[PDB]
Design an enzyme around this catalytic site. Structure first.
Site, PDB file in Angstrom:
ATOM      1  N   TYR A  80      84.599  88.632  90.225  1.00 51.37           N
ATOM      2  CA  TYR A  80      84.000  88.150  88.989  1.00 51.37           C
ATOM      3  C   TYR A  80      83.115  89.182  88.302  1.00 51.37           C
ATOM      4  O   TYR A  80      82.707  88.959  87.158  1.00 51.37           O
ATOM      5  CB  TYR A  80      83.142  86.909  89.257  1.00 51.37           C
ATOM      6  CG  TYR A  80      83.875  85.638  89.616  1.00 51.37           C
ATOM      7  CD1 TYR A  80      84.298  84.763  88.629  1.00 51.37           C
ATOM      8  CD2 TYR A  80      84.088  85.284  90.947  1.00 51.37           C
ATOM      9  CE1 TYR A  80      84.935  83.577  88.945  1.00 51.37           C
ATOM     10  CE2 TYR A  80      84.726  84.092  91.275  1.00 51.37           C
ATOM     11  CZ  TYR A  80      85.150  83.249  90.270  1.00 51.37           C
ATOM     12  OH  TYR A  80      85.770  82.055  90.579  1.00 51.37           O
ATOM     13  N   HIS A  92      81.980  86.295  81.667  1.00 51.72           N
ATOM     14  CA  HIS A  92      81.015  85.269  82.056  1.00 51.72           C
ATOM     15  C   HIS A  92      79.850  85.855  82.844  1.00 51.72           C
ATOM     16  O   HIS A  92      78.856  85.153  83.071  1.00 51.72           O
ATOM     17  CB  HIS A  92      81.741  84.209  82.892  1.00 51.72           C
ATOM     18  CG  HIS A  92      81.141  82.831  82.846  1.00 51.72           C
ATOM     19  ND1 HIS A  92      80.476  82.332  81.747  1.00 51.72           N
ATOM     20  CD2 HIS A  92      81.213  81.806  83.734  1.00 51.72           C
ATOM     21  CE1 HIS A  92      80.125  81.077  81.975  1.00 51.72           C
ATOM     22  NE2 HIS A  92      80.562  80.734  83.173  1.00 51.72           N
ATOM     23  N   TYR A  98      77.463  80.119  91.836  1.00 52.95           N
ATOM     24  CA  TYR A  98      78.491  80.008  90.803  1.00 52.95           C
ATOM     25  C   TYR A  98      77.883  79.422  89.534  1.00 52.95           C
ATOM     26  O   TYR A  98      76.878  78.702  89.572  1.00 52.95           O
ATOM     27  CB  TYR A  98      79.717  79.210  91.279  1.00 52.95           C
ATOM     28  CG  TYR A  98      80.539  79.981  92.300  1.00 52.95           C
ATOM     29  CD1 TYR A  98      80.228  79.918  93.650  1.00 52.95           C
ATOM     30  CD2 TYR A  98      81.597  80.801  91.904  1.00 52.95           C
ATOM     31  CE1 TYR A  98      80.963  80.637  94.591  1.00 52.95           C
ATOM     32  CE2 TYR A  98      82.335  81.531  92.843  1.00 52.95           C
ATOM     33  CZ  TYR A  98      82.003  81.439  94.177  1.00 52.95           C
ATOM     34  OH  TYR A  98      82.719  82.158  95.108  1.00 52.95           O
ATOM     35  N   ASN A 126      78.251  77.160  87.163  1.00 48.75           N
ATOM     36  CA  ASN A 126      77.970  75.785  86.771  1.00 48.75           C
ATOM     37  C   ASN A 126      76.957  75.101  87.672  1.00 48.75           C
ATOM     38  O   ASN A 126      76.566  73.962  87.377  1.00 48.75           O
ATOM     39  CB  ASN A 126      79.275  74.993  86.728  1.00 48.75           C
ATOM     40  CG  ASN A 126      80.203  75.491  85.639  1.00 48.75           C
ATOM     41  OD1 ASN A 126      79.902  76.473  84.949  1.00 48.75           O
ATOM     42  ND2 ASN A 126      81.328  74.815  85.465  1.00 48.75           N
ATOM     43  N   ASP A 139      76.173  85.036  78.725  1.00 52.99           N
ATOM     44  CA  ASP A 139      77.260  85.282  77.794  1.00 52.99           C
ATOM     45  C   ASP A 139      77.271  84.228  76.697  1.00 52.99           C
ATOM     46  O   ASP A 139      77.009  83.046  76.943  1.00 52.99           O
ATOM     47  CB  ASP A 139      78.603  85.293  78.526  1.00 52.99           C
ATOM     48  CG  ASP A 139      78.873  84.010  79.313  1.00 52.99           C
ATOM     49  OD1 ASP A 139      78.007  83.564  80.098  1.00 52.99           O
ATOM     50  OD2 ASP A 139      79.997  83.466  79.173  1.00 52.99           O
ATOM     51  N   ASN A 187      78.128  76.172  80.399  1.00 58.65           N
ATOM     52  CA  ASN A 187      77.985  75.308  81.561  1.00 58.65           C
ATOM     53  C   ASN A 187      76.977  75.825  82.579  1.00 58.65           C
ATOM     54  O   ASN A 187      76.567  75.065  83.460  1.00 58.65           O
ATOM     55  CB  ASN A 187      79.346  75.086  82.216  1.00 58.65           C
ATOM     56  CG  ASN A 187      80.252  74.228  81.360  1.00 58.65           C
ATOM     57  OD1 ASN A 187      79.785  73.331  80.652  1.00 58.65           O
ATOM     58  ND2 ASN A 187      81.549  74.505  81.401  1.00 58.65           N
TER      59      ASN A 187
END
Lengths: 193, 193
Positions: free
Chosen positions: A17, A22, A68, A70, A95, A116
């Protein structure tokens, strides 16, 4: 009190990631930490990676949730509670789909705008923290958003975002020294072209 | 124990991941649950979504970890330990880079093959569980893997995977009745019509 004392970068953990859009907030805080020689280290008590050190004469804490995106509140909320940092002293870098690559803005208050990560934070500490909105562009439809934010930007867009992040880094002195209106003016004036 | 009594589907939580290739295991187990009218319910004790019911005359548990893929052991390990389910009675469905869309195989034992969900499970229960390897294709380089598994397949590739999953669903009767060699032969022989 209006001095920013906690700077959070939102993103997802793991090398798969690290380069995705993000993770723009991680890029900002990682770069800020090394700019000032502040070590980011594993902080499992707060489900994140964190650091602390001198930024322009002020004792500032840095936080990357490892929850993570969310679930970012599971790190931000207990961390800010434990160190008794009020929302007005928190800057959260993230972001921003609704700004193009190269656009960067400092915002105080408001909602999550469908982000989120912010969605997991506002319910618990309220809206009155500051945000560094790092434009990543919008792919043009709701169904394309996930592949956009979980994708790596092409080099031209990455260059635009990097330049905006560099500019915001140059204004962190104003933020930590309690000059938020000045920082907002000078950050929001950034032109990528 | 010889029959399969626990069927796990690997994947990531949330609508933004639901259609990505890395969720192939979720697709299989979600479809299996509704085929037999087994309700999948929030199971926060085990950091997952789970259910239990009769599949072809056997009482079978179904589990979707809600940990995110690389932390799947945080659900699978305590769940299987609490219910005293041995690895030999576990089937884990997952996406397989090393097989193409439309290819599907049942495997017993071995390692994780670089799959970071299996990597979080094998250390704790050992390797001797069964796997339903759902081919998703390999994009051709390590650097392209993340965007592949975290991306949505095009419709033609999705149809191939869906047909393989449909075929494996029709063989679950053999698995829950303990006829694993017959299940392996019949699953692995699948080719798109």
């Amino acid at each position: 009190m209006s001095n920013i004392s906690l700077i959070v970068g939102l993103g997802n953990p793991g090398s798969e990631y690290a380069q995705t859009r993000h993770n723009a907030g991680f890029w900002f805080v990682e770069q800020l930490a090394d700019k000032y020689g502040i070590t980011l280290k594993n902080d499992p008590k707060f489900h994140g990676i964190s650091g602390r050190g001198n930024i322009e004469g002020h004792d500032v804490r840095l936080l990357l949730p490892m929850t993570y995106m969310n679930r970012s509140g599971q790190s931000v909320v207990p961390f800010s509670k434990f160190y008794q940092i009020a929302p007005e002293a928190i800057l959260i870098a993230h972001d921003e789909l609704d700004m193009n690559p190269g656009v960067i803005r400092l915002k105080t208050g408001g909602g999550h705008g469908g982000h989120n990560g912010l969605r997991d934070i506002v319910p618990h500490i309220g809206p009155n923290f500051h945000r560094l909105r790092i434009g990543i562009g919008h792919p043009g439809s709701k169904e394309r958003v996930s592949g956009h934010v979980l994708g790596k930007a092409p080099s031209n867009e990455q260059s635009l975002m990097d330049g905006a992040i560099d500019h915001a880094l140059s204004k962190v002195k104003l933020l930590v020294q309690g000059q938020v209106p000045q920082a907002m003016n000078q950050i929001n004036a950034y032109k990528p072209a």
